[PDB]
Design a protein around this ligand. Structure first.
Ligand code: NA
Length: 348
DNA sequence: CGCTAGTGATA
DNA sequence: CTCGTCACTAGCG
């Protein structure tokens, strides 16, 4: 996502412990636990050999949060946004390559390299995530499969007061407008918290501590929805945002070469791609657990047409979205793989 | 000299 | 059949 974002605003970071959120609700970007837990049993998944260590891993963290008296809500990624299809396919091809080479080209002789390639060809499937969901629900923990990206869903849960903090390793959460994000948490509950209001503690940031300006900085720096101009990182983006007074971001991006004293010819596609990136950060589709329907991250403004925001995810029926959120309906085939019912046991 | 972006080691 | 990350630094303006 946003490279070097954590180091850039480390002044706003506060080392905490999970006790600080006792008797409160916290949402967890489960994919990080799933991935770090799958790294341990990489060769097992590479060979196609049955294993469930990652389940015990995720449940270890969950049991920690529970032991400190916190109500955790596990969140998973759902469908992939159209602005990421070819990227996910690229990573798919990379995993296929690392698996093929790591297997056939390293089946005899070299072993360490074969494992080093197998750990790269590791793919987190929704079946594994479903195992985690079954275990978590067996331990009475609520789960939610996002309609699309997990970071938007989490940001919604946080901005709606449903949760008070978000445990993740992704730095993009801040660009979605989260209030409290707990990064780099270990087994015991030791992690780095970053509050939105505390963004002002960064002198280097200047007057770019407001949600909108901070978002513009994150996008200009280089995000998953849009690569940055060559030579533009966090410092340069922050600088050009600090210097410019004009509220209209388009003219600013057009004069990015003027404000930074460096020869930059802004591509025709970059402005539209910027608007699309910002619109994706603002209006990506999430699932409202209370109303049990599919809503945008933020309510649409007066200058935006919903029919042109297909890249921020497309709507489906609320019953289908509900079945997806419960992990009952498969992401790809849309087939019913489970029959969990929250009525006959959140979502109330 | 500040800052971007790529590499190598690593689980 | 869902996303890496960090320390170090070459090399840019
Ligand atoms: Na960049």
């Amino acid at each position: 996502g946003i490279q070097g974002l954590l180091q850039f605003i480390k002044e706003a970071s506060e080392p905490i412990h999970v006790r600080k959120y006792k008797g409160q609700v916290v949402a967890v970007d489960t994919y990080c636990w799933l991935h770090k837990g799958a790294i341990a049993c990489a060769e097992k998944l590479a060979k196609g050999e049955p294993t469930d260590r990652y389940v015990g891993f995720c449940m270890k963290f969950v049991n920690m949060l529970l032991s400190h008296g916190i109500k955790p809500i596990l969140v998973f990624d759902g469908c992939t946004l159209p602005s990421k299809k070819e990227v996910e396919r690229s990573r798919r091809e990379r995993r296929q390559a690392n698996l093929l080479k790591g297997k056939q080209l390293l089946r005899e002789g070299k072993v360490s390299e074969a494992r080093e390639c197998f750990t790269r060809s590791i793919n987190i499937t929704h079946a594994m995530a479903h195992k985690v969901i079954k275990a978590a629900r067996s331990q009475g923990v609520d789960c939610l499969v996002a309609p699309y990206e997990a970071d938007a869903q989490l940001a919604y849960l946080n901005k709606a007061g449903i949760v008070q903090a978000i445990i993740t390793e992704d730095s993009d959460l801040l660009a979605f407008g989260c209030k409290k994000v707990i990064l780099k948490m270990d087994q015991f509950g030791n992690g780095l918290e970053i509050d939105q209001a505390r963004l002002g503690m960064c002198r280097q940031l200047g007057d770019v501590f407001t949600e909108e300006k901070f978002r513009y900085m994150c996008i200009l720096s280089g995000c998953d929805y849009l690569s940055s101009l060559r030579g533009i990182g966090l410092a340069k983006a922050c600088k050009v945002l600090r210097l410019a007074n004009n509220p209209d971001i388009v003219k600013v991006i057009k004069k990015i070469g003027h404000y930074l004293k460096m020869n930059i010819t802004v591509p025709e596609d970059y402005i539209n791609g910027f608007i699309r990136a910002n619109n994706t950060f603002l209006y990506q589709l999430v699932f409202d657990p209370i109303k049990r329907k599919l809503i945008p991250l933020n309510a649409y403004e007066d200058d935006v047409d919903p029919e042109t925001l297909s890249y921020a995810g497309q709507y489906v029926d609320d019953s289908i979205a509900l079945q997806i959120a419960l992990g009952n309906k498969d992401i790809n085939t849309f087939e019913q793989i489970d029959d969990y019912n929250p009525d006959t046991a959140l979502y109330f």
